[PDB]
Prior knowledge:
Layout: E1 4-8, E2 12-19, E3 22-25, E4 35-36, E5 39-41, E6 46-48, H1 50-54, E7 63-64, H2 78-84, E8 90-94, E9 97-104, E10 107-111, H3 113-132, E11 138-143, H4 149-161, E12 165-171, H5 172-179, E13 190-198, E14 201-210, E15 213-222, H6 227-246, H7 254-271, E16 276-285, E17 288-295, H8 296-302, H9 304-309, H10 311-321, E18 330-334, H11 341-350, H12 365-378, E19 386-390, E20 394-399, E21 407-415, E22 422-429, E23 439-447, E24 459-465, E25 471-477, E26 483-488, H13 497-509, H14 511-520, E27 526-527
Parallel strand pairs: 1-11, 11-12, 13-18, 21-27
Antiparallel strand pairs: 1-2, 2-3, 2-4, 5-6, 5-7, 8-9, 9-10, 13-14, 14-15, 16-17, 19-20, 19-22, 21-24, 22-23, 24-25, 25-26
Helix pairs in contact: 3-4, 5-12, 6-7
Bound molecules: 1H-indazole and potassium ion (K) (2 copies).
PDB class: chaperone
Keywords: chaperone
Assembly: monomeric
Amino acid sequence: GPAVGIDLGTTYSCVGVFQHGKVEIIANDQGNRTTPSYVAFTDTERLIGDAAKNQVAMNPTNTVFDAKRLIGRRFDDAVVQSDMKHWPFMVVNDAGRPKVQVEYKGETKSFYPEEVSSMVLTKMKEIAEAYLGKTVTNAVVTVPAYFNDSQRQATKDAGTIAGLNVLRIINEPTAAAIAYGLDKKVGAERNVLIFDLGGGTFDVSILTIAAGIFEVKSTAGDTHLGGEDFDNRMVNHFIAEFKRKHKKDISENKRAVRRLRTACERAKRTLSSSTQASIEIDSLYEGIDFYTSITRARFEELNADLFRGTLDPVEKALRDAKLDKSQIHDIVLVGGSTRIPKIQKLLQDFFNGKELNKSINPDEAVAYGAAVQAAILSGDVTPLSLGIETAGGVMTVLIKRNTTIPTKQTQTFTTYSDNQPGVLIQVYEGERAMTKDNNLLGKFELTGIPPAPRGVPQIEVTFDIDANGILNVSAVDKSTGKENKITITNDKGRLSKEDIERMVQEAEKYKAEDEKQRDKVSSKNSLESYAFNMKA
Ligand SMILES: c1ccc2[nH]ncc2c1
Ligand SMILES: [K+]
Ligand SMILES: [K+]
């Protein structure tokens, strides 16, 4: 059977399959193309998805949601402690690990976060088996790009507990970019911005894509921004309008607030396609009908700070990627809140009128991409940065990865110590800040340097890659013309695509440590006479 793509989301999940040249997003038993990531425990039974979310107001302490915010984390994590305060269900500490604790069939029960997510995955797996008429065992599951190794491993465990063989865990922004065919471009590298406003979180990611390989350059966002915050601004507006018109505060009455909030969500969706929405609630409070309206402009005004606030993580991400906004080749809109026209207009104005990729249903695009990647797994540029070791074992890059071949790059270096008789040129490949974490390709010495104080002798190092892919590295003492050279072969099958992806992933994992190492370094043009990695 074909492998499925599963967007395991904070508030909802979505499953899709690539069949007959086309992705189909699979509707569940209620006919819905997404399924809430909720699990409810009752005296009679366990409910998953739509049934769970429907009865939440009736059974809030035994209805679990937001398990993705706990997955992979320790109880003591500051995120977990802050998030606990807002949840009606109990989270307890079992040997350093959080568990949700609920009453089920009269018995107190506790579940790890991955157990809860595995129940969501079982429901997704069942939804797909009903659609396909056959068992589903293979799946691609997505996670946020900022998930660390423990969160990724805990997501795979949930898939295993559910009986899925997880082919690969891939990042949500990568899924989205695959959905839009940005990997199939086959040309010079492209910078892609993924703008993901939905499922209770706001994530901005910048990716580079070249030769079928994705690298996450930077991520920013807000973990507690979503559509409910926009709806809440409307709710408080209408509570105030009711208090002003009828001198009554409906905040006392839980159901009244619930009815208003439901009306406000509906109006928000209307305002994405019309310039005004009608609110009609019979007997909202003390028998008073609440018939009114709201314009798109008022809704935008009510949310002005939240809407304009989404550009601050965009600016942050661009800074961390060391990119200007003009250097972004592709903008991709993911998440249900990106249907809001003011959001789209703010983003487009920020990018000087650049057209946005948004034709794929923004609620489904991540599942769309996972489904395509699952199908692939079922069935000329430099791959890695090139440089030499400078003083202290620092990787100093002469040719960034994704550089077009042929190419020639030269840089000038000096000596680290006084009267240094020679320098050791050590060629490395990789994306880490220290040579010890990259791959040594070759080394040669340039000796005969005339005695001089530190920093005086000038050594020019040249990296040349011809059309055949052979790398020639040479060094010249600029005071004498004496030189030395090494040739480095690039046979087919030296690096597999998997080897490249591994190197890229390690770079994304240690991006924090390495970027602070690049701030920490003082001189990146000094060369020593010994290999730093062989020094005791
Ligand atoms: C040797 C090692 C790495 C390389 N990258 N591109 C050409 C090449 C040659
Ligand atoms: K996901
Ligand atoms: K999001």
